[PDB]
Amino acid sequence: CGETCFGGTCNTPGCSCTWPICTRDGLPV
């Protein structure tokens, strides 16, 4: 996802917040 979940929330669906980076299915894509 690459996106940073600074506010805990992610902009990309499927990506889980793994502060400071969102990971979809555990993948930091």
Side-chain angles (χ1 to χ4, degrees), residues 8-27:
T9 325
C10 301
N11 197 181
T12 318
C15 298
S16 309
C17 180
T18 315
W19 220 99
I21 60 176
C22 298
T23 57
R24 67 145 301 182
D25 306 59
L27 301 176

Side-chain angles (χ1 to χ4, degrees), residues 1-13:
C1 318
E3 63 160 306
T4 295
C5 53
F6 184 53
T9 325
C10 301
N11 197 181
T12 318

